[PDB]
Design a protein around this ligand. Structure first.
Ligand code: MG
Ligand code: ZN
Ligand code: ZN
Ligand code: ZN
Lengths: 145, 578, 83, 199, 123, 95, 568, 99
DNA sequence: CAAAATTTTCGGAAGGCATGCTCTGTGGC
DNA sequence: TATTTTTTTGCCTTCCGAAAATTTTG
RNA sequence: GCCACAGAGCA
């Protein structure tokens, strides 16, 4: 085991969520799939889920973590409802602004609606953006693109 | 979560790097220092003694004790080393000739090699060629030694160098002594060392004239301590010309002089139990180790309390002889020791001969799943078939792994049991580690619960590949591969067309039957060592498996010109051959 | 970089006896560990005879990597080799 | 938060898995070896993303399993420095507070030095108090949603002890270890702490 | 037996142990307390070791992440250290094969250290 | 083949063969082993005898080649997957 | 209680006892001052002798050609690597790199060198020349060799530049700074081999002289050319240049100056002789001897004759010629002989000489003559009389006495005064028996046996076995004892080298263990404010670490005072 | 063991080993002389070459370089005997697969 | 040129080595 | 304690004075 | 049980 490169690419939470939901659909790991025949149905024979418990546990934990809302008054995280077209639109909107790759990645991962959260993600907001640009960015992130 | 990724890579052996252990390497691998002569303490029902030659930390010799280092029984313990510090250094009997060769190439006054820088550079250039093999290296080193012997006086100092040799070249303590004749090449040129020598002897002869007769034989002796201190100040750049690689810390001449003796694990010198319970016989290595401890303690106590110098040197020589017998018992006469006769089995005696490690346990060794039986003829067998007795086939087993293609067969074999011949003797489950005997189980629940990865040791049945061997193996056809048939008459049976490669005749001959336990070995035996694929000897390509006596004569009588058969006799003969 | 291309293969195209023995042993060991077979086995249970039937009509998925003394090797498909 | 790591590995496919597709078998072996495990000096691996190059399967003499040299990109959980993240408080100590990312990684510790200024811990209520203003009735209650900022990524060795020191320790236990991956949170900026506080 | 014969000086009680220590017990007289002249000599040693440690000829042992942040500005550079090819070499003292790595046509700066007058070792 | 007539003896094999364990297993075991230890020679495990002694496959007969199982993975099946964030993000507007 | 082999391998120096003292010392010094790459190169050169760049690349794992070339440049600038360029018969040219003890000893003696420079030129009066001399010598030692123009390019004050130039001239006049050249980078043996072969070829072919006559003539020509080449550094050829403004002597600008190790070792030998004379003849007479040795120090004979390292001692006649030449140069050198009048001008004001002598039971010439006659009439040959009133130091006859005295007193301090008595007893009558020792040296027989058994372990006493049987049995043979000087001196030199190397290894291990705290404490803002900016526990650890480092360096200096006598 | 009175096994001597060598059957020789007689799983250190116990090297005092291998027990016995004779047969290991 | 140091030759002593496997019985600590 | 036999044969190299031969000094 | 010794089998 050798690590050719520590960082090959950056993954947003949307990409990981979509990939793991596709993996759960492929391996029949979704809550609907287990509710169908895994429990409370007799005809579970000849159709079996993927046996690996460790991967199933970690993918369930990750999908539960990325599914719930990290930024709310207290139910969905928004990236679950987001699609490829909305992601591309959000990329096109945020690329026009005066932001770095890490800041854009954190904006995608967390999707702020609170104002102080957007203060926290990008540092020296007052020394880089005026109130109009900050309000425009908050409007862009508000609709989840 | 928190587990770290483990990566195990399969590996083989690329090579071996022979060397000698330094003091730090000997102590580092040690687990206890042997500092007690007594093997057992009489106050604890003859338990092994702490810091002794049979210390438990060095392993266990019985099946009831614990190692107290790895906490394992006799089966699961690899053995651990101890170390023993000698009071004074002694010469290594194995490296004695190497020590003499090193001393013959260095100045005995400043430990510098007796070579000019031009010759040194030329010999290093010869030694560092890309294509140098062992023979060329030994030749270059011999030339270096011969050139060093010709150097009458050193280069860095003006010291006179004589000839370094053994004291007597025999089989006693004098055979383990090095003398340096300094004034053998002096001639009549009035060397300044000769003036000091004659001044010394004039000064000492005024008090003891009786020594005057012994002045001629008096030479500069090289005791192990002086040799060690001389080796300690050898420049590392000159070690390559003496045959030693100085790039590693263990590549120094002083490594080849005994300072720390590695006491071997007791798993390689076990105490042999006898028929008498209170007493257990000990290996010769352990007794010699205790003797070495006793002599070194005696030497140290004599150094501390100031015993006479003759006794000191005598006990030093006794320690040298004891370590020499501990390594090679045939090197020195046991009668020279005060205690002493059958010579002990040293480490050299365990490695050489037909009964040693190499020719008795490494090149050839006892194998399992083999049988030996008298042979008798059987013409009805095919030439690639040997008949095994039913009794032998119930002992020699083949481990078949349960697959999707042979589950029912192995279930039937498990049900049949160890007594009925088409059966099995042992079963090893996939998740288990110890095979279970089928002579005690239910034998019906085991068959029903036969998994898809279990290994069942079934009896030798028909079609099994067996190696058939006659012990005077002269050519490769003396061991072949046959298909097993099972017959009830307590003898091996092979076709008489096959007894010619074996050089075997049925007048009391016994042959051996090996059963390969691996699919790869089975396939290799049946495809490369088969009787069908070995019908021609590789000596000349001529057939070796063909008609023998009583088959040539019958064929000649059939094919004789006055042999006429009607249809009844013809048809009977044709049914007889098929 | 040590792989000789298929066009410039210089070793013999015939399967040696050692290659046959090693191939049969490897396939028998694989079958003994519950590998799928590509033949219509007629009640055979021994892995060796199944491997022999597999080699009989060239239905075995292995290649021979023949190592030249210099270091370069040479990949030959078993079905390509002549037996 | 999540990055892609390119790793070369040697996978052992057993001969009973030959009926499966080779990509699926390689991915299954890689998930046995790597999933939900700590890659040293890299982080925590989630799932094998994809395979880039696959070599020919080499066979060891004496085993029918096929060994394949496979290069793969895998999704590994590596929060970079300065990235903020939301977790749930599991337990609070005198030295600091412990937060878990909902079962993914329960090894995040926020100490006193990087926490809110003036915070103090009192055992009876089991929470940390931050005197921000006159309305200082704010508690770092357990099982609550906190936001923090990653400041240090610490790796320690998984070096085992001596054998004898292992049986004696096991015998004493019969009669806590440093995690190989850990992160240190911080609360040195407004907006960290409880998410409901900055509503 | 190998055990019967004993030297005259020794007895049975004092032999059979073989405890040779691994630790020496004969010290040189150089281990006395330090003096003022020796203290000045020692701080001269320390100063020379430090000034060779950070000099142009060190050749030492044989978090810079690729991520880009706005904190890169307002962050100063560590040090513009002197390299092996930034020294006024006397080319008559060196072999011809070493000319490639010394930068024969480059900027030449002589790194001259300043002597520390006080014994700045904290006691 | 070494330039001279060696002979099939202990002395001849001591010059022909540079392996240590092969010579040690024939004759003069202790002398050869101690000479190897003193001269610190490296013995490559390539001969049949030391392969038997160490218990691994010899390089003659069935060990002169390596059996390789040809994987059926095409290049088309090994295309990199979609990495949306690193592709759609650009830093043209800083700089 | 019992100590495990784990504890022995951990807390003791058993792993370091298996290392050659030369290699261990050189590698430790280079790793302490330079980096680990230079340490690897120096260690490989010590282990394998001379090597090429390609051989160093192929022998050391983890270094390529450029890295090896860079570290060879770094070592060559500090004069830690000698080199020789040689051409093969086929025409290929190869550079072979050696190791020289000169640069490693410069690294080892650096603070002692700075202290000797500071003390020797009598700048003890005030402070600014203390600063300038210390900084220029430290820069010269640290950079290996530097030019004066490049040094003065960093100074902007004209008066400071003038004082620095004058101090450089003062250093060059008294021999401490010399001109570096390819002579200091070529081996002595290779130079003598080249000269001998050149003078052998210049002998005409078919000469009437035989082979031995040709060899003798070539040896004579090689010896005179070698003497000229060796003494060429010391002719003051770099100082003859005068500045464009008159009445000022300056060192040449483009010349490269280097520190002279031979002059420093001459000073160390003078200090050792003063310390030896302080134990035999008074304290005022010791001061007179000190002034005499400081005066006749620059022109004194070198510590080691380079011709002795050329491999020429295999001929006994060459050994006698070297001894006679040494006895000639120590006497007939014009600057070595001195009178009382010569020493009268160099006496200090504090020295009185007035009431120091009693004839029967102000810097005058008679009192100095009386003191020098006390020095010359002592048992140790501190001074000798050629003609009456003229004195010279007998360096050929005084230095074995110094070596023997230092060796005997080291044995006295370590193994006891009885060890001194036994060693000197065995030395005085050369070959002795146990009974003759007991009669001649009056002490108990068991004490004699124990003491000689202890002395045998350190090569002090060698056992001569005289056998009285056909087989050399220890019971029937008779054992005499002799004392060989060279074996014991070499053994103790190696022992002191190992102790110095082990001390440096312990210091480096301590610094590597406390590296974080030492890096924190040595920062620019932290320094000078350690009490304010550091915790009390870190302050106490820094206290202990610095005290231990100072003790290590003090013990190193004391060892160096005890080890250079056997390098004489 | 030796002899049918101690339920012993038959000896595959030098001549039979050499005949199997002449046939070219490497796997059969490995099975007969290692698998069926004295196979032994041992710890080998990759740095110092010496063998260890329980996944631990007593010389380096670390478990980083321990590798599981299978050798004949006679080889381990020979290595320990040589180590008792001041000979160090340090094994050097390499990967089976070229990678 | 003949003494004298050096190199090569020539004997005699000293170790090392000598088929494979297999089966019993007896004796001594 | 001291009288006192061998119980295969052939081949081989290394060591080491002794002696012959050659070189080298004076 | 260990160690030697002795005999025997097959070319
Ligand atoms: Mg017969
Ligand atoms: Zn154990
Ligand atoms: Zn010498
Ligand atoms: Zn190790």
């Amino acid at each position: 085991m050798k690590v050719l490169e520590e960082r090959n690419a950056f993954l947003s939470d949307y990409e990981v969520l979509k990939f793991l939901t596709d993996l759960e659909k492929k391996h029949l790991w979704d809550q609907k799939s287990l509710a169908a025949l895994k429990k409370s149905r007799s005809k579970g024979k000849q159709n079996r889920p993927y046996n690996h418990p460790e991967l199933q546990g970690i993918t369930r934990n990750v999908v539960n973590y990325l599914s719930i809302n990290k930024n709310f008054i207290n139910e969905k995280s928004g990236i679950s409802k987001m699609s490829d077209e909305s992601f591309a639109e959000l990329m096109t909107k945020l690329n026009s602004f005066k932001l770095f790759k890490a800041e854009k990645l954190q904006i995608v991962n967390q999707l702020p609606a609170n104002m102080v959260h957007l203060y926290s993600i990008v540092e020296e907001c007052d020394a880089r953006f005026d109130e109009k640009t900050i309000e425009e960015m908050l409007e862009i992130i508000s609709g989840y693109a | 979560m928190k587990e770290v990724v483990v990566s195990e890579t399969p590996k083989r052996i690329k090579g071996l790097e022979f060397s000698a252990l330094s003091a730090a390497d000997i102590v580092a691998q040690s687990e206890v220092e042997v500092s007690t002569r007594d093997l057992f303490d009489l106050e604890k029902d003859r338990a092994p003694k702490a810091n002794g030659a049979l210390d438990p930390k060095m392993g266990v010799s019985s099946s009831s004790l614990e190692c107290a280092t790895c906490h394992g029984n006799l089966a699961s313990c690899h053995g651990h080393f101890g170390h023993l510090k000698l009071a004074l250094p002694v010469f290594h009997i194995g490296y004695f000739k190497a020590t003499i060769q090193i001393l013959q190439g260095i100045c005995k006054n400043c430990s510098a090699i007796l070579l000019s820088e031009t010759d040194k550079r030329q010999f290093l250039h010869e030694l560092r060629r890309p294509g140098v093999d062992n023979l060329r290296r030994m030749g270059i080193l011999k030339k270096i030694l011969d050139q060093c012997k010709k150097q009458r006086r050193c280069l860095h100092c003006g010291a006179l160098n004589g000839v370094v040799k053994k004291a007597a070249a025999g089989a006693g303590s004098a055979a383990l002594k090095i003398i340096h004749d300094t004034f053998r090449w002096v001639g009549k040129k009035s060397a300044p060392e000769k003036d000091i020598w004659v001044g010394e002897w004039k000064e000492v002869l005024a008090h003891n004239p009786e020594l005057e007769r012994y002045v001629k034989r008096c030479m500069d002796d090289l005791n192990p301590l002086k040799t060690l201190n001389l080796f300690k100040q050898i420049k590392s750049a000159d070690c390559e010309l003496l045959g030693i690689d100085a790039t590693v810390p263990s590549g120094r001449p002083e490594t080849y002089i005994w300072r720390y003796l590695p006491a071997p694990p007791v798993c390689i010198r076990p105490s042999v139990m006898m028929q008498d319970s209170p007493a257990s016989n000990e290996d010769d290595l352990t007794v010699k180790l205790t003797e070495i401890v006793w002599t070194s303690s005696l030497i140290k106590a004599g150094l501390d309390k100031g015993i006479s110098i003759n006794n000191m040197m005598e006990h030093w020589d006794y320690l040298q002889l004891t370590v020499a017998m501990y390594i090679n018992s045939d090197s020195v006469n046991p009668a020279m020791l005060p205690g002493s006769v059958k010579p002990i089995r040293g480490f050299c005696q365990r490695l050489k001969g037909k009964q040693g490690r190499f020719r008795g346990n490494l090149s050839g060794k006892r194998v399992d799943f083999s049988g030996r039986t008298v042979i008798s003829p059987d013409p009805n067998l095919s030439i690639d078939e040997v008949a095994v007795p039913d009794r032998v086939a119930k002992v020699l087993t083949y481990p078949e792994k349960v697959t999707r293609y042979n589950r029912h067969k192995l279930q039937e074999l498990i049900v049949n049991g160890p007594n009925v011949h088409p059966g099995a003797n042992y079963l090893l489950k996939r998740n288990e580690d110890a095979r279970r005997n089928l002579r005690y189980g239910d034998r019906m629940k085991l068959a029903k619960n036969l998994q898809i990865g279990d290994v069942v040791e079934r009896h030798l049945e028909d079609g099994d590949v067996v190696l058939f061997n006659r012990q005077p193996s002269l050519h490769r056809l003396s061991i072949l591969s046959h298909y097993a048939k099972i017959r009830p008459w307590r003898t091996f049976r092979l076709n008489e067309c096959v007894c010619t490669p074996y050089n075997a005749d049925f007048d009391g001959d016994e042959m051996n039957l090996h059963v390969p336990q691996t699919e790869e070995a089975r396939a290799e035996a049946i495809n490369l060592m088969g009787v069908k694929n070995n019908l021609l000897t590789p000596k000349s390509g001529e057939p070796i498996i063909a008609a023998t006596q009583d088959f040539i004569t019958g064929s000649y009588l059939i094919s004789h010109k006055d042999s006429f058969y009607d249809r009844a006799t013809l048809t009977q003969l044709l049914s007889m051959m098929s | 970089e040590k792989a000789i291309p298929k066009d410039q293969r210089a070793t013999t195209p015939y399967m040696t006896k050692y290659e046959r023995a090693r191939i049969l042993g490897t396939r028998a060991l694989q079958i003994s560990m519950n590998a799928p077979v590509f033949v219509d086995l007629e009640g055979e249970t021994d892995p060796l005879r199944i491997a022999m039937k597999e080699l009989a009509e060239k239905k075995i998925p292995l290649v021979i990597r023949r190592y030249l003394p210099d270091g370069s090797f040479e990949d030959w498909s078993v079905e390509e080799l002549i037996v | 938060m999540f990055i892609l790591s390119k790793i070369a590995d040697l996978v052992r496919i057993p001969p009973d898995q030959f009926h499966r597709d080779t990509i699926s078998a390689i991915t299954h072996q890689l998930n046995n070896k790597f999933a939900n495990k700590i890659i040293p000096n890299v982080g925590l691996c989630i799932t094998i993303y994809d395979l880039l190059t696959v070599e020919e399967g080499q066979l060891k003499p004496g085993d029918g399993s096929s060994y394949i040299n496979v290069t793969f990109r895998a999704v590994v959980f590596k929060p970079f420095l300065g990235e903020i993240v939301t977790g749930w408080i599991s337990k609070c100590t005198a030295e600091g507070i412990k937060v878990s990312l909902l079962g993914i990684f329960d090894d995040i510790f926020i100490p006193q030095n990087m926490l809110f200024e003036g915070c103090y811990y009192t055992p009876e209520e089991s929470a940390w108090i931050w005197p921000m203003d006159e309305e200082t009735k704010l508690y770092f209650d357990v099982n609550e949603k906190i936001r923090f900022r990653i400041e240090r990524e610490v790796f320690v060795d998984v070096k085992p002890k001596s054998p004898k020191e292992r049986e004696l320790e096991e015998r004493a236990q019969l009669e806590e270890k440093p995690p190989a991956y850990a992160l240190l949170g911080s609360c040195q900026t407004d907006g960290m702490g409880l998410v409901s506080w900055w509503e | 037996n190998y055990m019967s014969n004993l030297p005259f000086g020794l007895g049975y009680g004092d032999v059979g142990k073989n405890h040779i220590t691994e630790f020496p017990s004969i010290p040189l007289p150089i281990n006395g307390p330090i003096t003022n002249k020796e203290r000045s000599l020692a701080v001269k040693y320390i100063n020379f070791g430090k000034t060779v440690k950070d000099g142009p000829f060190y050749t030492g042992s044989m978090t810079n992440d690729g991520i880009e942040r706005y904190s890169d500005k307002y962050l100063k550079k560590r040090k513009i250290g002197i390299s092996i090819d930034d020294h006024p070499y006397n080319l008559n003292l060196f072999p011809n094969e070493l000319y490639n790595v010394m930068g024969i046509n480059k900027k030449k700066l002589l790194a001259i250290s300043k002597f520390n007058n006080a014994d700045d070792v904290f006691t | 083949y070494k330039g001279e007539v060696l002979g099939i003896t202990r002395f001849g094999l001591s010059k022909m063969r540079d392996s240590v364990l092969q010579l040690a297993s024939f004759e003069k075991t202790t002398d050869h082993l101690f000479d190897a230890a003193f001269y610190m020679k490296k013995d490559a495990v390539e001969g049949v005898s030391e392969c038997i002694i160490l218990g691994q496959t010899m390089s003659i007969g069935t060990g002169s080649f390596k059996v390789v199982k040809g994987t059926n993975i095409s290049e088309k099946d090994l295309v990199p997957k979609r990495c949306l964030f690193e592709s759609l993000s650009n830093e043209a507007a800083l700089k | 209680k019992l100590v495990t082999p784990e504890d022995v391998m951990t807390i003791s120096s058993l792993e370091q006892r298996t290392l050659n003292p030369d290699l261990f010392l050189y590698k430790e010094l280079v790793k302490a001052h330079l980096g680990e790459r230079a340490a690897s190169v120096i260690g490989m050169l010590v282990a394998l002798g001379r090597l090429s760049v390609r051989e160093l690349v192929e022998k050391i794992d983890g270094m390529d050609v450029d890295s090896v070339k860079t570290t060879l440049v770094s070592l060559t600038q500090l004069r830690c690597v000698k080199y020789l360029q040689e051409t093969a018969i086929s025409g290929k040219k190869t550079t072979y790199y050696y190791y020289n003890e000169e640069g490693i000893h410069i690294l080892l003696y650096s603070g002692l060198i700075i202290d000797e420079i500071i003390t020797q030129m009598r700048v003890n009066d005030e402070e600014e020349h203390k600063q300038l001399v210390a900084e220029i010598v430290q820069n010269v030692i640290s950079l290996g060799s530097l030019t004066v123009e490049d040094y003065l390019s960093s100074v902007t004050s004209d008066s400071m530049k003038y004082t620095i130039s004058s101090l450089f001239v003062q250093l060059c006049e008294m021999g401490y700074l010399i001109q570096i050249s390819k002579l200091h980078y070529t081996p002595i043996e290779d130079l003598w081999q080249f000269l001998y072969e050149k003078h052998y070829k210049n002998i005409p072919r078919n000469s009437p002289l035989s082979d031995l006559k040709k060899r003798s003539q070539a040896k004579m020509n090689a010896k005179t050319d070698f003497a000229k080449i060796i003494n060429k550094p010391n002719e003051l050829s770099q100082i003859l240049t005068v500045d464009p403004k008159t009445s000022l002597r300056i060192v040449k600008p483009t010349v490269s100056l280097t520190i002279n190790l031979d002059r420093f070792m001459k000073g160390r030998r003078s200090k050792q002789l003063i310390n030896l004379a302080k134990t035999r003849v008074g304290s005022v007479t010791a001061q007179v001897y000190k002034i005499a040795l400081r005066l006749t120090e620059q022109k004194s004979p070198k510590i080691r004759d380079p011709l002795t390292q050329t491999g020429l001692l295999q001929d006994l006649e060459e050994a006698k010629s070297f001894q006679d030449e040494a006895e000639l140069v120590e006497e007939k050198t014009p600057g070595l002989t001195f009178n009382a009048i010569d020493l009268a001008r160099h006496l200090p004001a504090e020295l009185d000489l007035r009431g120091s002598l009693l004839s029967r039971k102000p810097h005058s010439a008679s009192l100095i003559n009386s003191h020098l006659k006390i020095l010359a009439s002592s048992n140790f040959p501190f001074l000798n009389e050629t003609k009456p009133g003229v004195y010279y130091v007998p360096y050929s006859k005084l230095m074995p006495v110094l070596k023997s005295s230092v060796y005997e007193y080291v044995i006295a301090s370590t193994l006891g005064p009885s060890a001194m008595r036994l060693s000197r007893c065995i030395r005085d009558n050369k070959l002795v028996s146990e009974k003759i020792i007991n009669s001649t040296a009056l002490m108990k027989e068991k004490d004699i046996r124990s003491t000689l058994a202890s002395l045998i372990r350190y090569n002090s006493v060698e056992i001569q076995e005289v056998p009285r049987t056909a087989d050399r049995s220890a019971s029937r043979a008779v054992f005499l004892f002799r004392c060989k000087e060279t074996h014991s001196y070499n053994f103790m030199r190696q022992n002191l080298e190992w102790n110095m190397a082990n001390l440096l290894f312990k210091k480096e291990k301590l610094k590597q263990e406390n590296s974080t705290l030492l890096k924190k404490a040595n920062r620019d803002d932290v320094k000078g404010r350690e009490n304010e900016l550091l915790l009390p526990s870190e302050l106490n650890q820094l206290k202990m670490v610095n005290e231990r480092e100072l003790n290590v360096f003090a013990r190193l200096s004391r060892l160096l005072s005890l080890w250079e006598v056997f390098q004489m | 063991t030796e002899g049918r009175s101690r339920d012993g096994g038959l000896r595959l001597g030098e001549m039979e080993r050499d005949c199997v060598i002449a046939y070219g059957a490497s796997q059969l020789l490995l099975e007969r002389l290692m698998i069926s007689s004295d196979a032994f799983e041992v710890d080998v250190c990759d740095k110092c070459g010496l063998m260890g116990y329980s996944g631990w090297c007593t010389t380096c005092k670390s478990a980083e370089n321990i590798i599981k291998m299978t050798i004949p027990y006679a080889a381990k016995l020979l290595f320990q005997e040589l180590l008792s004779m001041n000979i160090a047969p340090r094994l050097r290991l390499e990967d089976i697969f070229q990678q």
